[PDB]
């Protein structure tokens, strides 16, 4: 896997914020979540809320029956990553109590000034086999690729900020495994 279009983040001239008099624009930077999973079924999500009283907007699938406990841990908030444009990043994480059939990897770097650091290479393979030499097994002859790559925020001329995202490439080798029942 790698992030596609990393160089696009060098566009420091498109109605950005001058860092200072005659400065170039402030480049895309700040709070970032880079995450990607390979699964024989949907990624399984646990809900966790920064603020349980946050009203997640009509059209997104969010933790229902939020209590103050939702802010730290509340096992009611289970869900399947089964729909796009659906599950907000900021209220769902991989549920570590149940992704036996998925391999997930992610990193949050928080901070308004966090510099983006994106490596690209066609030389780097990641193995998906577990302690027992078994990879994810594709139930229903389906493979489930999940990803988030919030790279940072674009700072407009006014100072107003928009999250900026990038596509993620996947190439998964698969083989056949004999299975009972």
């Amino acid at each position, epitope marked *: 896997t790698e992030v596609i279009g990393v160089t696009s983040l060098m566009n420091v001239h498109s*109605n950005g914020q001058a860092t200072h008099d005659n400065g170039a624009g402030k480049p895309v930077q700040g709070t970032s979540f880079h995450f990607f999973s390979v699964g024989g079924e949907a990624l399984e999500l646990q809900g966790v809320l920064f603020n349980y009283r946050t009203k997640y907007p009509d059209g997104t699938i969010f933790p229902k029956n939020a209590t103050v406990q939702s802010q730290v841990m509340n096992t009611e908030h289970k869900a399947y990553l089964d729909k796009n444009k659906a599950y907000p990043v900021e209220c769902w994480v991989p549920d570590p109590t149940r992704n036996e059939n998925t391999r997930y990897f992610g990193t949050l770097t928080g901070g308004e000034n966090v510099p983006p650091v994106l490596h690209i290479t066609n030389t780097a393979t990641t193995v998906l086999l577990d302690e027992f030499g078994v990879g994810p097994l594709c139930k229903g002859d389906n493979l489930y690729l999940s990803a988030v790559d919030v790279c940072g925020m674009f700072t*407009n*001329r*006014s*100072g*107003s900020q928009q999250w900026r995202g990038l596509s993620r490439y996947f190439k998964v080798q698969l083989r056949k495994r004999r299975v009972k029942n």
Partner: antibody
Amino acid sequence: EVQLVESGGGLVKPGGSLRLSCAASGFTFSSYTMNWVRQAPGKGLQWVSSISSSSTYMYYGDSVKGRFTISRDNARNSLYLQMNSLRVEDTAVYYCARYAHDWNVDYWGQGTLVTVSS
Amino acid sequence: SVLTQPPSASGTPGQRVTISCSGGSSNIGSNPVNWFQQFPGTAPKLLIYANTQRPSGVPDRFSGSKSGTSVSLAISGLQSEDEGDYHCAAWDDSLKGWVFGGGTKLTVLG
């Protein structure tokens, strides 16, 4: 500079009709969503209609839903407002305005007067 | 769903005058406010954009503040050349349109 110039405004009787014209020079007109905003004599401002760069999204204030139609010709660098079934309330100066990302509504024309009287 | 600004405001030359614009979550909460200055017999012109920013040509004196669903315009070092109507505007997500305020006629005394 950026210059917007309205025209087509005049006197009509209720139930009348009228087509307004905005002429854009100074910028790639074909790149920007464009607006009509009107100002009834003595009273404040009131947005009429929006149109996207490619005319994919037109929006109208409800005061004119069904009666007015916004359009553009990107080859003729011109924004239009088709005003049908004109009423006395529709009397105003009709300004033409440009929306730009972040800058929001920025540049305005001189306005053109539409008077609707029996 | 409508923007509320004082119908009138006034001050003595050299004073700071403050015109407020109050909206709700559907408009000013999630969308930016531009301020437009309008002299008798003239078009509106951009004075403030994005709540708090000056285009080239607008003095230091003109400033803005945002606190959630309400914004204010601050004319400091008030002058007679500042006599006019001040229009408050912002997109409303519910009405899918631009909402304006009533306008604020600023009188300068002397």
